[PDB]
């Protein structure tokens, strides 16, 4: 898993924030001027693997996403998560996108 | 708050799912063929109002989002949350978008 390897610094990335639980890094193919990926260090494949037993942990991840977003994007930010084929999920390790740095489009998908 | 009123059925909506904690309804200006809004019935203004004290509740909301998404969008779905001006947040009551029903675009914002 490329995201487990990035989180453990086996594959290089430009680190925005890291702690015992999460790892955040710049997206190398950005769609916004600020485009950050936030991953749990623990491998969970997608949002469809959230259970009642790990929902408190995923809430903590989302809280830490908000702390990164409000620091990096004081003018506002969008959080995106992709599940499966129609959403274009490329890596099967849950990753939140933080998008900001401009007035973001809201266009037909 | 228009979303508190929708959640309490004071303003009509097309309901997808409802329980003691959450309310989900069709977006009337959709950007995808499946476009569902999911709100907590409790008023929380945005993701920037997540705290360590409510992070477990927001994890539960995200779990219920995933249950709606995997049912309505078995081929995959995207979850979006907008915070503040640059993201275009229009209603100050936290709302998750579930987008699906086609191979979704990933375009420059
Ligand atoms: Zn992984
Ligand atoms: Zn409200």
Swiss-Prot record, chains A, B:
Enzyme nomenclature, EC number: 3.9.1.-
Disulfides per UniProt: none
Domain of life: Eukaryota
GO cellular component, one term: nucleus
HIT domain mapped to chain residues: 2-109
Record keywords, A-Z: Cytoplasm, Hydrolase, Nucleotide-binding, Nucleus
Chain ranges for the short sequence motif Histidine triad motif as given in the UniProt record: 93-97
Gene3D superfamilies per UniProt: HIT-like
Catalytic activity: adenosine 5'-phosphoramidate + H2O = AMP + NH4(+)
Matches recorded under PROSITE patterns: HIT_1 (PS00892), HIT_2 (PS51084)
Matching PANTHER family: HISTIDINE TRIAD HIT PROTEIN
Function per UniProt: Hydrolyzes purine nucleotide phosphoramidates with a single phosphate group, including adenosine 5'monophosphoramidate (AMP-NH2), adenosine 5'monophosphomorpholidate (AMP-morpholidate) and guanosine 5'monophosphomorpholidate (GMP-morpholidate). Hydrolyzes lysyl-AMP (AMP-N-epsilon-(N-alpha-acetyl lysine methyl ester)) generated by lysine tRNA ligase, as well as Met-AMP, His-AMP and Asp-AMP, lysyl-GMP (GMP-N-epsilon-(N-alpha-acetyl lysine methyl ester)) and AMP-N-alanine methyl ester. May also function as scaffolding protein that mediates protein-protein interactions.
Family statement: Belongs to the HINT family.
Name under which the protein is recorded: Histidine triad nucleotide-binding protein
Species for this entry: Entamoeba histolytica (strain ATCC 30459 / HM-1:IMSS / ABRM)
Phylogenetic classification of the source organism: Eukaryota, Amoebozoa, Evosea, Archamoebae, Mastigamoebida
């Amino acid at each position: 898993c490329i995201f487990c390897k990035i989180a453990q610094k086996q594959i290089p990335s430009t680190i925005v924030y890291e702690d015992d639980e999460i790892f955040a890094f710049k997206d190398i193919n950005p769609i916004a001027p600020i485009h950050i990926l936030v991953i749990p260090k623990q491998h969970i494949a997608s949002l469809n693997e959230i259970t009642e037993e790990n929902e408190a942990f995923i809430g903590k991840v989302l809280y830490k996403v908000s702390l990164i977003g409000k620091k990096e994007c004081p003018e506002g930010y969008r959080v995106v998560n992709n599940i499966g084929e129609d959403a274009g999920q490329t890596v099967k390790h849950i990753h939140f996108h933080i998008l900001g740095g401009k007035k973001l489009a809201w266009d037909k998908l």
